[PDB]
Amino acid sequence: PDYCIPNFSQTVNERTIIDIFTICRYRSPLVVFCLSHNELAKKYAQDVSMSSGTHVHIIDGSVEITVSLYRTFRTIATQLLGRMQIVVFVTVDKSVVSTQVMKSIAWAFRGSFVELRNQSVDSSTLVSKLENLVSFAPLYNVPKCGPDYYGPTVYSELLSLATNARTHWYATIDYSMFTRSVLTGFVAKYFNEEAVPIDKRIVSIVGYNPPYVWTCLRHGIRPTYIEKSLPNPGGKGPFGLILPVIHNPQIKLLCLDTFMLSTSMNILYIGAYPATHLLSLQLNGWTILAFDPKITSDWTDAMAKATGAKVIGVSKEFDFKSFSVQANQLNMFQNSKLSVIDDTWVETDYEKFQSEKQAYFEWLIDRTSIDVRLISMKWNRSKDTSVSHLLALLPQPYGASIREMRAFFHKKGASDIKILAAETEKYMDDFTAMSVSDQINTQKFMHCMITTVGDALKMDLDGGRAVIASYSLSNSSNSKERVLKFLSDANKAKAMVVFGAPNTHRLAYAKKVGLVLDSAIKMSKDLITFSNWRDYGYSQSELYDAGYVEITIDQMVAYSSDVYNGVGYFANSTYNDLFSWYIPKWYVHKRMLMQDIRLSPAALVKCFTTLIRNICYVPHETYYRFRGILVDKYLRSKNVDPSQYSIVGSGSKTFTVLSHFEVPHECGPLVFEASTDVNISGHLLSLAIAAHFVASPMILWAEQMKYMAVDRMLPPNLDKSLFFDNKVTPSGALQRWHSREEVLLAAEICESYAAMMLNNKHSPDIIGTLKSAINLVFKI
Amino acid sequence: DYCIPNFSQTVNERTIIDIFTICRYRSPLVVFCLSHNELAKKYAQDVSMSSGTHVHIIDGSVEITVSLYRTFRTIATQLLGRMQIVVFVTVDKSVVSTQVMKSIAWAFRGSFVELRNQSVDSSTLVSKLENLVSFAPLYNVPKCGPDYYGPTVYSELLSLATNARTHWYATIDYSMFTRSVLTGFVAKYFNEEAVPIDKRIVSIVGYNPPYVWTCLRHGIRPTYIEKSLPNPGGKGPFGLILPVIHNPQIKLLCLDTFMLSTSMNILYIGAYPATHLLSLQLNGWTILAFDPKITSDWTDAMAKATGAKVIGVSKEFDFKSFSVQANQLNMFQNSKLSVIDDTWVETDYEKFQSEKQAYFEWLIDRTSIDVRLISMKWNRSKDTSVSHLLALLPQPYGASIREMRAFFHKKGASDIKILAAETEKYMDDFTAMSVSDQINTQKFMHCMITTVGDALKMDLDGGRAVIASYSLSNSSNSKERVLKFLSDANKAKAMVVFGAPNTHRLAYAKKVGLVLDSAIKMSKDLITFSNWRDYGYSQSELYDAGYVEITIDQMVAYSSDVYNGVGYFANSTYNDLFSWYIPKWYVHKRMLMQDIRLSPAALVKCFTTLIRNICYVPHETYYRFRGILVDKYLRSKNVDPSQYSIVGSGSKTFTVLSHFEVPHECGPLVFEASTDVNISGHLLSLAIAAHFVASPMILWAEQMKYMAVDRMLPPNLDKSLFFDNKVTPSGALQRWHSREEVLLAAEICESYAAMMLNNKHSPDIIGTLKSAINLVFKI
Numbered sequence A: 001p002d003y004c005i006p007n008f009s010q011t012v013n014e015r016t017i018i019d020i021f022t023i024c025r026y027r028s029p030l031v032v033f034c035l036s037h038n039e040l041a042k043k044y045a046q047d048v049s050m051s052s053g054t055h056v057h058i059i060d061g062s063v064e065i066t067v068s069l070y071r072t073f074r075t076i077a078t079q080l081l082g083r084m085q086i087v088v089f090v091t092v093d094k095s096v097v098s099t100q101v102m103k104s105i106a107w108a109f110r111g112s113f114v115e116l117r118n119q120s121v122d123s124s125t126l127v128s129k130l131e132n133l134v135s136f137a138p139l140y141n142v143p144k145c146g147p148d149y150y151g152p153t154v155y156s157e158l159l160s161l162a163t164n165a166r167t168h169w170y171a172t173i174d175y176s177m178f179t180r181s182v183l184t185g186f187v188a189k190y191f192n193e194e195a196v197p198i199d200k201r202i203v204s205i206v207g208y209n210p211p212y213v214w215t216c217l218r219h220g221i222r223p224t225y226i227e228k229s230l231p232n233p234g235g236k237g238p239f240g241l242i243l244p245v246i247h248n249p250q251i252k253l254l255c256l257d258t259f260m261l262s263t264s265m266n267i268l269y270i271g272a273y274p275a276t277h278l279l280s281l282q283l284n285g286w287t288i289l290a291f292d293p294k295i296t297s298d299w300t301d302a303m304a305k306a307t308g309a310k311v312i313g314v315s316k317e318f319d320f321k322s323f324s325v326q327a328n329q330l331n332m333f334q335n336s337k338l339s340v341i342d343d344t345w346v347e348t349d350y351e352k353f354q355s356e357k358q359a360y361f362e363w364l365i366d367r368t369s370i371d372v373r374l375i376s377m378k379w380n381r382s383k384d385t386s387v388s389h390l391l392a393l394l395p396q397p398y399g400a401s402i403r404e405m406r407a408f409f410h411k412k413g414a415s416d417i418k419i420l421a422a423e424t425e426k427y428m429d430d431f432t433a434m435s436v437s438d439q440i441n442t443q444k445f446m447h448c449m450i451t452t453v454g455d456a457l458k459m460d461l462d463g464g465r466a467v468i469a470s471y472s473l474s475n476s477s478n479s480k481e482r483v484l485k486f487l488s489d490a491n492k493a494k495a496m497v498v499f500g501a502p503n504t505h506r507l508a509y510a511k512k513v514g515l516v517l518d519s520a521i522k523m524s525k526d527l528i529t530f531s532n533w534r535d536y537g538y539s540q541s542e543l544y545d546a547g548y549v550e551i552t553i554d555q556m557v558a559y560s561s562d563v564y565n566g567v568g569y570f571a572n573s574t575y576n577d578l579f580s581w582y583i584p585k586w587y588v589h590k591r592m593l594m595q596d597i598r599l600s601p602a603a604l605v606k607c608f609t610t611l612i613r614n615i616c617y618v619p620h621e622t623y624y625r626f627r628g629i630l631v632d633k634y635l636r637s638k639n640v641d642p643s644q645y646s647i648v649g650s651g652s653k654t655f656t657v658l659s660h661f662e663v664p665h666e667c668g669p670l671v672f673e674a675s676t677d678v679n680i681s682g683h684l685l686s687l688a689i690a691a692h693f694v695a696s697p698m699i700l701w702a703e704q705m706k707y708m709a710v711d712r713m714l715p716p717n718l719d720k721s722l723f724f725d726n727k728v729t730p731s732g733a734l735q736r737w738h739s740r741e742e743v744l745l746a747a748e749i750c751e752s753y754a755a756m757m758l759n760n761k762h763s764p765d766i767i768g769t770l771k772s773a774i775n776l777v778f779k780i
Numbered sequence B: 001d002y003c004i005p006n007f008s009q010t011v012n013e014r015t016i017i018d019i020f021t022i023c024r025y026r027s028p029l030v031v032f033c034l035s036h037n038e039l040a041k042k043y044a045q046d047v048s049m050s051s052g053t054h055v056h057i058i059d060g061s062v063e064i065t066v067s068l069y070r071t072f073r074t075i076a077t078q079l080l081g082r083m084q085i086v087v088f089v090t091v092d093k094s095v096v097s098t099q100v101m102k103s104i105a106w107a108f109r110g111s112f113v114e115l116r117n118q119s120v121d122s123s124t125l126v127s128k129l130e131n132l133v134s135f136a137p138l139y140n141v142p143k144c145g146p147d148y149y150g151p152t153v154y155s156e157l158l159s160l161a162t163n164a165r166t167h168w169y170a171t172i173d174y175s176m177f178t179r180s181v182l183t184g185f186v187a188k189y190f191n192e193e194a195v196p197i198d199k200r201i202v203s204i205v206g207y208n209p210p211y212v213w214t215c216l217r218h219g220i221r222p223t224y225i226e227k228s229l230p231n232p233g234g235k236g237p238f239g240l241i242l243p244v245i246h247n248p249q250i251k252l253l254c255l256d257t258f259m260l261s262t263s264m265n266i267l268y269i270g271a272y273p274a275t276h277l278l279s280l281q282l283n284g285w286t287i288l289a290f291d292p293k294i295t296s297d298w299t300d301a302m303a304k305a306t307g308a309k310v311i312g313v314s315k316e317f318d319f320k321s322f323s324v325q326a327n328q329l330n331m332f333q334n335s336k337l338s339v340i341d342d343t344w345v346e347t348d349y350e351k352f353q354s355e356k357q358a359y360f361e362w363l364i365d366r367t368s369i370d371v372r373l374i375s376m377k378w379n380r381s382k383d384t385s386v387s388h389l390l391a392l393l394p395q396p397y398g399a400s401i402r403e404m405r406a407f408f409h410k411k412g413a414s415d416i417k418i419l420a421a422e423t424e425k426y427m428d429d430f431t432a433m434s435v436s437d438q439i440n441t442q443k444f445m446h447c448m449i450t451t452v453g454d455a456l457k458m459d460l461d462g463g464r465a466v467i468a469s470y471s472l473s474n475s476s477n478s479k480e481r482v483l484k485f486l487s488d489a490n491k492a493k494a495m496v497v498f499g500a501p502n503t504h505r506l507a508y509a510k511k512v513g514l515v516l517d518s519a520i521k522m523s524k525d526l527i528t529f530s531n532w533r534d535y536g537y538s539q540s541e542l543y544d545a546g547y548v549e550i551t552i553d554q555m556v557a558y559s560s561d562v563y564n565g566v567g568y569f570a571n572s573t574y575n576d577l578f579s580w581y582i583p584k585w586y587v588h589k590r591m592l593m594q595d596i597r598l599s600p601a602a603l604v605k606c607f608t609t610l611i612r613n614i615c616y617v618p619h620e621t622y623y624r625f626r627g628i629l630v631d632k633y634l635r636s637k638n639v640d641p642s643q644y645s646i647v648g649s650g651s652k653t654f655t656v657l658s659h660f661e662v663p664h665e666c667g668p669l670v671f672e673a674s675t676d677v678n679i680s681g682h683l684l685s686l687a688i689a690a691h692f693v694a695s696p697m698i699l700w701a702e703q704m705k706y707m708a709v710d711r712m713l714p715p716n717l718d719k720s721l722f723f724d725n726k727v728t729p730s731g732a733l734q735r736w737h738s739r740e741e742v743l744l745a746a747e748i749c750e751s752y753a754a755m756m757l758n759n760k761h762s763p764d765i766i767g768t769l770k771s772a773i774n775l776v777f778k779i
Helices: A014-026 A038-052 A065-079 A099-108 A124-136 A171-193 A212-218 A251-263 A276-280 A297-307 A350-364 A421-432 A436-441 A444-450 A480-492 A504-512 A540-545 A553-559 A585-591 A607-615 A620-638 A682-690 A698-707 A740-748 A750-757 A764-777 B013-025 B037-051 B064-078 B098-107 B123-135 B170-192 B211-217 B250-262 B275-279 B296-306 B349-363 B420-432 B435-440 B443-449 B479-491 B503-511 B539-544 B552-558 B584-590 B606-614 B619-636 B681-689 B697-706 B739-747 B749-756 B763-776
Strands: A030-035 A055-059 A086-090 A111-116 A202-206 A222-227 A266-270 A287-291 A310-314 A337-342 A371-379 A385-387 A390-395 A405-410 A417-419 A451-453 A466-469 A496-502 A521-524 A527-530 A534-536 A548-551 A579-584 A645-647 A655-657 A661-663 A670-672 B029-034 B054-058 B085-089 B110-115 B201-205 B221-226 B265-269 B286-290 B309-313 B336-341 B370-378 B384-386 B389-394 B404-409 B416-418 B450-452 B465-468 B495-501 B520-523 B526-529 B533-535 B547-550 B578-583 B644-646 B654-656 B660-662 B669-671 B675-677
Touching: A014 A607, A030 A038, A030 A099, A030 A124, A038 A055, A038 A086, A038 A124, A038 B064, A055 A065, A065 A086, A065 A607, A065 B037, A099 A111, A099 A553, A111 A124, A124 B619, A171 A212, A171 A466, A171 A496, A171 A553, A212 A222, A212 A251, A222 A251, A222 A444, A251 A276, A251 A337, A251 A371, A251 A444, A276 A297, A287 A297, A297 A310, A337 A350, A350 A371, A350 A385, A390 A417, A390 A421, A390 A444, A417 A421, A444 A451, A480 A496, A480 A540, A480 A579, A496 A504, A496 A534, A504 A521, A504 A764, A540 A548, A540 A698, A540 A764, A548 A585, A548 A698, A579 A585, A585 A698, A607 A620, A607 A682, A620 A645, A620 A655, A620 A740, A620 A750, A620 B123, A670 A740, A682 A698, A682 A740, A682 A750, A682 A764, A698 A740, A698 A764, A740 A750, A740 A764, A750 A764, B013 B606, B029 B037, B029 B098, B029 B123, B037 B054, B037 B085, B037 B123, B054 B064, B064 B085, B064 B606, B098 B110, B098 B552, B110 B123, B170 B211, B170 B465, B170 B495, B170 B552, B211 B221, B211 B250, B221 B250, B221 B443, B250 B275, B250 B336, B250 B370, B250 B443, B275 B296, B286 B296, B296 B309, B336 B349, B349 B370, B349 B384, B389 B416, B389 B420, B389 B443, B416 B420, B443 B450, B479 B495, B479 B539, B479 B578, B495 B503, B495 B533, B503 B520, B503 B763, B539 B547, B539 B697, B539 B763, B547 B584, B547 B697, B578 B584, B584 B697, B606 B619, B606 B681, B619 B644, B619 B654, B619 B739, B619 B749, B669 B739, B675 B739, B681 B697, B681 B739, B681 B749, B681 B763, B697 B739, B697 B763, B739 B749, B739 B763, B749 B763
Parallel strands: A030 A086, A030 A111, A055 A086, A202 A222, A202 A466, A222 A451, A266 A287, A266 A337, A287 A310, A337 A371, A466 A496, B029 B085, B029 B110, B054 B085, B201 B221, B201 B465, B221 B450, B265 B286, B265 B336, B286 B309, B336 B370, B465 B495
Antiparallel strands: A371 A405, A385 A417, A390 A405, A496 A579, A521 A527, A527 A534, A548 A579, A645 A655, A661 A670, B370 B404, B384 B416, B389 B404, B495 B578, B520 B526, B526 B533, B547 B578, B644 B654, B654 B675, B660 B669
């Protein structure tokens, strides 16, 4: 062996790389707690620190807020892979650091954010959430990178002796729902930044993906699907939707309402009260005309303030026997699109009441004055009846074992069809006895009305059209030649097509070291096959050649914090880490070249290097000594005279130039002026190591690094506290980082750097595809 | 299984392997003492932001007792986190003395630095503060010891010439650390028992060279006792005349420490400068130094640094005066005396040696002075007869030099002729050998303080200190006879520090596939090491012989105020396979009061917290599993469920509703109605730690039984050392757990280890500990 430190031979073997992959499942230990009672914070900080060893920080204002954040999170950035919980108590007022700024910094480091600074010192809510820190450590019931959670993990079951003090834990499923929510929040943030009109905030979800309807209505955008091949439903009508062939406590009503809220920006909601499920939706741009006798004056103000929509609530019954546009205040929807949500019903003469409604909806749909889109009515008829302008007769996917159906009226519906009673009762007898999973499964018939059939690669990309392709375009049906052509054209067209694909070389490195076995995922060349479908792999370089920069889910949720209304997560998933997400290059240059904390790689640049330095006995200054030695081995490998430079190998000086010399490089010859100090970019080396295990923001960091060749003024609208991680000149501008020579020099030694840190058990393909992408960013 | 807490998918066979690997990092603490608080805050931020080192600043804003309680209760949970921990202590020495803070530091396996007397711009203070930022997560100051003389040079990690690397021999350095800790414990034993200075002699069973240095570093005299010492092959009564063939100041300490073992009175001729002696505590010695260059300050400097009574003569030694009234030898009447002759001249060296030899041949035949040993430099080119000559060895650290050493003794050869032609070719061979072989020949020198015979039949009178570094554990001595020797030693109130490989800890290491079969092979309790055979001993059968297992952590912490040896930098898995045991009589007499030096604080949390982080085990959920494990045991003994109520919290394991008893061999467990039961959680965690490192379960159990009721704090010990435990307003250590709460945890201990390690534990490890807990609590 070898008896010397730092030791990489005996410490970093193939099983060590496996354990590093395992540690990445714990890489979100931060909890940011905001309370206005400092002495109370000191107690619980001591309680959780003594009981479970959680590292605590108390930003109390004794130090300036900018330097206080700089000292707190520069330390946390190194400990994110330490498998130990980290709590940061923020006790300064919201005037010192606002709720949105602190929430951004929290989610930028993958942490749970709790804001309770308005609470009194003896608040039952404040003390309870503080006791949860000590009870649940090292875990915490508050979701990370999100305010709400609707998955199966119930933290209160961990304290219950009846449930054996256990709860469920589906990391891959929960992070998938977290990813669907983050993509939606980023598109919502995209619409807000581009000042897109409210009625134009529509996103195309490539491939059928049910949960996107809910996430889109949570962020104030309307969803629309586009599937490659949608099979025939098997019913009657123009679209064949009449009788087709066959854990959220408030999704029973949100399943139908969110879909109807996608068909129009104006809604006639009959029988709305209480409509409590709508309160957790951002409806800023909608106009709700609510009809119910139990509607009060406070109910209208409560719905409008919680959703942002213009709500006009009528405290009367709906006049169904008046056939005029002057009744029920329908005059406010002239020359407009309108949809009707009918939830009215009675247990006395239900057949007689439905006939009165049907005659009104059959007339309301034939309005040349109002573009009535869709009308949803409760259907339960024991007699044969003819329906005009009927598009769909679907069961209630969340109605469970109930007997009621739903009818959908549309202009392009069946001109006249006869709904036989003996056919619906038998149809319901089958739907009534199905499993709950199959009952909820039949909600795809409902989403068919907002689905366009065709190829997503041939769609129109006009005016910055938002298109979410969740792993869709990457599957083997679409060729890599055509997908790269679609994304390159989309970037030229200034369109927002968020694209995701499996990282080819990250999965190859996972199978090489024996992480995920051959039984789960099999790979051949760049073609990937998943088991319980085939899929193409894409690297980070070829997508930059198509004009797409890889961004991390961490950076997307952090950049979209002030508009995020979705769900969070608790644990990371190795399966989800195999994929990478890319946004077009035009939007990166326009609004993402100024590296704030939300768009910084702070949550990844230090945690991997520190973990390896602790495992391999690498002292701090010794780490920078190895940096100079690696540079010394590269300069002499290119026949540079050793007397022309002087290897310092410190944190501030990599090496000093003594006489002018140049190094041949494809991105222009590296110019080294005499009597100058060279300090190569260390983040490039560490981000390449982090790319072996998780999605690395190397491409976005490089674009920011090139933009920081000179001093750049801070954005005027953004809070300047978000730039705490970087130096700011007294002028008020972000200080220059590194020269193009210092950055390209680190890319050349990057191959030998990974061979040192991982004991030659790295992936030269991972370093190669990143090195190739760094060169294209710094093209001459 | 998709449920948390998860033990199935998380704790596999390789997971146990990685836990063993983490135990190599289980000493990350650094305790830094400086009197400049704002300067400490800066370097605390510098090392925290650069390397992620967790820092603590005890500044006095909180009371010192509560401040230590909050700081180290947290550190105890993080000792397996692979991250450096620094504790800056800025309060005055009046708030916490240097010896108290050093004990607390070494109790948690930490490097201790005391620089509170330094000014804010001291070049020494700032340099050692910059070393924290430069060397993190490592540190150049050794743990549990002030000095380090091994091959690891930290300044080479910063040098580009050495490729920023240095050597790293963890097993060798920790072995030297163990030899030094054993010596320091014996030295602490002599200080506690008030043993007279001249009686402080320890027997080192089996030949072990470095113990001569460590003993003289702690003011005690060593003596060897070997099973079979081969004949040296020379002439003389003991055959020591011409036998058959990294410390910068060991060149002189090799000879002087051996001569300082032969007598408590020394005549050092040619002492100046004698700088090597300054690092030894010679409290009890009397040095009569002869050299012209001796000054008045030199005598005071030697006496202050060593504690010895030094009388330094600023003159030459009168060799041509044959009387006890010359050279002030009148102070050694009716006393033992040994002389160290280091005088020499480059002009007529032969003529000067003949004058010395005639004096030493007369000085050895003194009925007035019990002259023990005389060491003279020998270099004669002519044939000469020597009277009263015991040995003539080469200088083991003389390297390629031509000079030899002669040793005069009363029991030496009455008359022998030293032929010049034989000693010239003998030096020609000694000069040509390797340096390792030159130093290897220092066993001939130590032969003069070596008794030949069997250590199992020695006399154990009046608390005799005997150190057996794995010697008694080897296969030559049967386990039946060794256990008989140790049981007799404990009855005789003797101090025989005994060490042996932990049978079940090595078995658990081989079962999971840590140390492979090529290095260590085991059969039953017989162990074979590669690169000799050895018997294994468990913690229970040694308590049956009246011996309690103590950890090297607790020994160096308990001996902090007398420790003068070396520290260590990294732990070694090879050394962790062995356990160290001290007699039971000394544990009951002075170790039943659990202070921080004798507490298992450095092990009771770090293993449980690491497993809770790996397996997603919440804090309160951990205590829920505790009650469920108790509920599974009470039901297994046919206790009616309506007689108790499972609470499963940190303060209440379960509440008793009606009186019921559980049959147990240590008396039936009595559970009074309307009372709360809180089983001892430390017993469960110490059993888990016993799978990987030496666990102080036996010592903790003896302290736990003594803490059945309140006990007054010792009057002499600083009461700050009891910060880890509750103290009543009366000034006494508050009671811990009842005998029912402790024995109840021992019964669920088997199922507890099956849950924490996913049934991949060792029932033998739990069994030998559970058996020992019963013998401590025997009725």
